[PDB]
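[#protein-structures] MJ: dropping Lactotransferrin here for a structure pass
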Amino acid sequence: YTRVVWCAVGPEEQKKCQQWSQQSGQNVTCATASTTDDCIVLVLKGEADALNLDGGYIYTAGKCGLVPVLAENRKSSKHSSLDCVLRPTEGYLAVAVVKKANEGLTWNSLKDKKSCHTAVDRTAGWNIPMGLIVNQTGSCAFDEFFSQSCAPGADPKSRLCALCAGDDQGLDKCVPNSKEKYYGYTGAFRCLAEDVGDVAFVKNDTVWENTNGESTADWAKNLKREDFRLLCLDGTRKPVTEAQSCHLAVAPNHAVVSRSDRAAHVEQVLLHQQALFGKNGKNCPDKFCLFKSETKNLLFNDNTECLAKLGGRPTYEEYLGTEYVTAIANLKKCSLEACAF
Ligand SMILES: *[C@@H]1O[C@H](CO)[C@@H](O[C@@H]2O[C@H](CO)[C@@H](O[C@H]3O[C@H](CO)[C@@H](O)[C@H](O)[C@@H]3O)[C@H](O)[C@H]2NC(C)=O)[C@H](O)[C@H]1NC(C)=O
Ligand SMILES: *[C@@H]1O[C@H](CO)[C@@H](O[C@@H]2O[C@H](CO)[C@@H](O)[C@H](O)[C@H]2NC(C)=O)[C@H](O)[C@H]1NC(C)=O
Ligand SMILES: *[C@@H]1O[C@H](CO)[C@@H](O)[C@H](O)[C@H]1NC(C)=O
Ligand SMILES: OC[C@H]1O[C@@H](O)[C@@H](O)[C@@H](O)[C@@H]1O
Ligand SMILES: [Fe+3]
Ligand SMILES: [Zn+2]
Ligand SMILES: [Zn+2]
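AK: finished. structure tokens for Lactotransferrin:
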């Protein structure tokens, strides 16, 4: 069958997808949707084959019968003798970051503060932090906890979108795709760097990747790590160097998903595409690179060393783990076993 149709989310990812489509000699073609959800539907219908998703969306995808095929792996310390493609995935840390100058803000005094979220339904940006607030607060009232937030994908007229800025001209406020200024890992972190919000729910790697001259993007150019603190669950605050002992949760890596009747095909094409455009691809730095997009995480997170085989041929609950599958179950009790679509 040999030709994969990718789903890009919003126009910037479409533009990266068209390029990959060019360089691959149409072995990969593109579809476009304004939202991760519309992309998942395009996959069910049969009009696209695959997309990379965050743990929170893999849960949506999986109730609809979709399946993880390959997982993003990043450069690890331990596990160094194995090749990247076969090496297990380590998971990322979900953290809550605050400005250091904001003395006195802790996990215990987040109520009525201003929040930056990656997007509704994502792991570190939404499910993990809102999950814990609901429990601790004993209330599905998670929409009234923060005075104001930017939480792409929530109702544009509610407080959950008060802090989102839309695109170049103000259109598309709160859409869950990179058109929204403060969408995604990088979005949320900006939303705090610029002091729009008081706290940002991102992952550990995002603090490092956008501070101390690692980015060269205008907003981040002068961000110093020493200016941030991680909020831990014990009430404490610690340097961003201590993420290992001050995190909300370890999240399952983002993974490529596809209908089950297409996974073997979507896998064969991906391992060959990354052998050409992956980190050491034949054609990576010279012609085109899959895992790069100047700090914008389009299609894949910029720090992806390689897409990895899963091994144990896991279902979507086994891939996500029972810890996580229970938190998403319990939090979705607030807003009964079916596919949303
Ligand atoms: C928010 O609070 C929820 C209510 O406690 C909590 O869900 C509960 O999570 C624990 C840990 O997953 C579960 O305990 C499980 O552990 C053993 C060993 O693996 C299992 O064999 C047990 O059957 C059990 O699943 C509870 O089951 C689960 N409770 C219920 C009623 O669903 C969430 O974890 C909290 N959310 C967050 C983000 O922390
Ligand atoms: C938090 O994230 C950063 C960045 O992803 C991790 O630091 C990297 O660590 C790797 C492997 O240890 C090094 O080769 C890199 O030089 C680091 N990147 C940068 C830009 O500093 C860090 O390890 C993560 N911290 C934890 C606890 O996982
Ligand atoms: C297109 O697919 C064919 C079939 O696998 C392969 O031999 C060819 O190299 C591919 N072209 C590129 C540049 O990916
Ligand atoms: O909490 C779930 C996550 O835990 C991490 O430590 C890894 O084991 C991942 O495989 C998993 O997705
Ligand atoms: Fe994520
Ligand atoms: Zn932990
Ligand atoms: Zn299994």
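MJ: nice. The chain has two domains: 2-73+255-316, 74-254+317-327.
AK: one more thing. The chain is about 30% helix and 20% strand.
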